[PDB]
Design a binder for this molecule. Structure first.
Ligand SMILES: [Zn+2]
Lengths: 627, 157
């Protein structure tokens, strides 16, 4: 029966009245009304024949359905655009999103319900604003569309239209007395959206309506937002339209200069120097009436970090573009503060370019500041910690790493914290965070790479003690992976994701020193994965015995010590001696294997099937289970 | 022939193309060395694997020098791995090759790894006494004053 629904869907997508009529003809009234009510979620989005006709922009099909079949226009579907899914949208919403003017004309002329209840509170006017068609917006608004209707984020149609940057729709909505004073969830105003868009005409139109200057939650006044977005024209327009004190305009000018210097997109130091010099002359313009200048305390990350306050002080800094950039960073960090996370992007970039070729030191300290900032926030830094891993690989390849253990201890604390946080995240839900489970695995890999870095380097015994404190903190809590794998199991298996930036002379699996240090920490040797495979069961399977024979010999002689059972059957009977395939690995085991009567008795009593339940001390039940 | 000299050089693409022409790789020279010997000297594991793929058999030169032994002499472990894996051989030849590899690591200047030599010889000799009550014999040549004591070891102690 659903085949008829698919045929109607295809006919609606085609746009032919003849095919759709023929498919709907020779069917009962109930059948055709069920076809109209049915939604074929081919892409997982509800789309009734009217809804999908509106989305596909076929005027003929929409006209036929509305005129001859009386399909309900109040049907709402969770249509998705560019991956993002709106959880509710009527037929008129899809018509506006399609961008076809005849379809929206017909649907509105057939009494389409513009105001439809929706969990996302989406409206067809918002869809038209997203599409940007002025004519569709006009036709929707004229025929009973409430512009004041906003989504769950309190984002109105006018707000998103100003964000888009289309001057026509903003002008039309302002003509229809659309209120721009509504506040979104963040509380930003329409002036903030216009400054972000960078359209001077939108800002001028908003000023014409006399929109109030309202500071957002994290500061971010419209002049400050425009200065951050490098909208010099918008900043000048706001300063001219709204009177500001000396402090406000001087701060705006210096923020604009520092933003121009710091960002890689602009990358103009002459404009930055000119703006800073102008602002500081404005500080001293009056004469004996000087704006109070504060100096941030010196920080080892920024070096001297002396914020200059006199004209000769910047005059001495005409050259040394690095000094100008770091001073702009100081200015931006002082003005903006650490309240928001917007300053996360520049600092790393300022490190990144600095990280092109040099000792990495103040780059590392800048990234440490970025780490602190991102750890105040609940923002995932697994990509960032990867980047630190490749940077460490770079410096160890350069052989000039001379690494300081304080930084590695700090990043170990951070990675432990994020491990715990994302473990709780998986404790909340699983399906949505499957990619977060992939990041779980990746972060375990990063810790192994950090352990490989620590093994390659060497430092003071107290620093090693702190490293071992952190690794024991990670070990005491028992990490697990899909199908179950301890740290040792990864450390002995062929860990597929070897660092691509540096895969040679660094991070090679089947390592001996890593396993030695992990045993020193005290990981549970007799831990069993799914199917019960022990550590020895995933080291005798090595396929290159004659090469790298030193590694195999060392790992075997290390794991045989620290108490590892010589025989530990698991699921189907597989002794470590049976599973070995090389033909060379058996020798190393049989040299180190130590015999005892317990093992022989257990093998004898399990080979034959004798009852061993409730006739044996409870401890030996597990012993018999092993052998 | 271009085949053996290309194998000596180690250019994988040209050797692969020449083999594609179905040229017989069992050709010989005045020295009697087959392309396997030149590949072993080059040590390209992929070249040797490709040669084995199309049925290149081990052939002994008149003065001994089986390609496996020749590869073992020049301290080329990977070729030894590959040939031992594919080319079936007895206990005696395998242990002889392992001992030769140990000695070559011991004395030569290119690698000069004392521990690798010790461990390889230890493994070979442990393989010698594996069975028990059926022991491969070890023949010791009379001492040479050039080496001083010049007496080999046949007991693990
Ligand atoms: Zn036992």
């Amino acid at each position: 029966m659903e085949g008829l629904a698919g045929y109607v869907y295809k006919a609606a997508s085609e746009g032919k009245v003849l095919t759709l009529a023929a498919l709907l003809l020779n069917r009962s009234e109930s059948d055709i009304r069920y076809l109209l009510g049915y939604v074929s979620q081919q892409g997982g989005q509800r789309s009734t024949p009217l809804i999908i006709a509106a989305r596909n922009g076929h005027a003929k099909v929409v006209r036929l359905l509305l005129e001859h079949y009386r399909v309900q226009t109040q049907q709402t579907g969770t249509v998705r655009f560019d991956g993002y899914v709106i959880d509710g949208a009527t037929a008129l919403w899809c018509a506006a999103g399609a961008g076809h003017f005849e379809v929206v004309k017909l649907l509105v002329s057939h009494g389409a319900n513009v105001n439809h209840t929706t969990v996302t509170n989406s409206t067809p006017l918002r869809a038209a604003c997203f599409d940007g068609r002025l004519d569709i917006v006009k036709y929707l608004v004229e025929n009973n569309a409430n512009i004041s209707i906003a989504n769950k984020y309190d984002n109105t149609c006018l707000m998103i239209a100003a964000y888009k940057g289309h001057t026509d729709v903003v002008r039309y909505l302002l003509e229809q007395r659309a209120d721009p004073n509504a506040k979104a969830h963040c509380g930003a105003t329409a002036l903030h959206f216009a400054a972000e868009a960078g359209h001077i005409d939108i800002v001028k139109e908003l000023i014409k309506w006399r929109a109030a200057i309202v500071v957002n939650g994290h500061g971010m006044t419209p002049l400050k937002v425009a200065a951050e977005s490098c909208k010099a024209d918008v900043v000048e327009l706001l300063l001219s339209h709204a009177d500001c004190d000396r402090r406000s305009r001087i701060e705006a000018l210096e923020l604009l200069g520092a933003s121009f210097a710091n960002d890689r997109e602009n990358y103009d130091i002459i404009k930055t120097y000119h703006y800073l010099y102008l602002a500081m002359l404005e500080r001293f313009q009056d004469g004996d009436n000087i704006l109070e200048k504060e100096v941030l305390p010196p920080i080892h990350a920024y070096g001297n970090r002396t914020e200059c306050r006199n004209p000769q002080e910047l005059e001495s800094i005409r050259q040394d573009r690095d000094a100008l950039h770091m001073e702009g960073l100081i200015v931006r960090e002082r003005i903006l503060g650490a309240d928001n996370i917007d300053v996360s992007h520049p600092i790393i970039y300022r490190g990144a370019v600095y990280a092109d070729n040099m000792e990495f030191e103040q780059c590392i300290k800048l990234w440490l500041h970025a780490l602190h900032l991102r750890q105040k926030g609940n923002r995932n830094t697994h990509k960032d910690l990867l980047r630190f891993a490749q940077v460490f690989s770079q410096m160890i390849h350069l052989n000039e790493t001379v690494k300081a253990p304080d930084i590695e201890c700090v990043l170990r604390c951070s990675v432990l914290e994020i491990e715990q946080s994302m473990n709780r995240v998986k404790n909340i839900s699983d399906a949505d965070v499957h990619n977060a489970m992939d990041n779980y695995e990746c972060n375990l890999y990063t810790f192994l790479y950090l352990v490989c870095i620590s093994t390659k380097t060497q430092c003071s015994e107290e620093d090693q003690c702190k490293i071992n404190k952190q690794i024991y903190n990670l070990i005491h809590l028992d990490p697990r992976t899909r199908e179950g794998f301890t740290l040792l199991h990864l450390a002995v298996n062929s860990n597929t994701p070897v660092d691509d930036f540096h895969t040679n002379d660094v991070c090679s699996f089947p390592n001996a020193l890593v396993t030695k240090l992990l045993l020193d920490c005290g990981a549970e040797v007799n831990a069993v994965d799914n199917e019960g495979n022990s550590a020895l069961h995933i080291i005798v399977q090595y396929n290159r015995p004659i090469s790298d024979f030193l590694t195999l010999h060392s790992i075997i002689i290390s794991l045989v010590e620290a108490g590892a059972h010589t025989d530990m059957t698991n699921k189907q009977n597989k002794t470590p001696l049976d599973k070995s395939t090389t033909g060379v690995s058996e020798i190393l085991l049989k040299t180190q294997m130590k015999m005892s009567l317990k093992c022989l008795a257990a093998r004898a009593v399990r080979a034959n099937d004798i009852n061993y339940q409730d006739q044996i001390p409870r401890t030996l039940e597990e012993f018999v289970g092993f052998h």
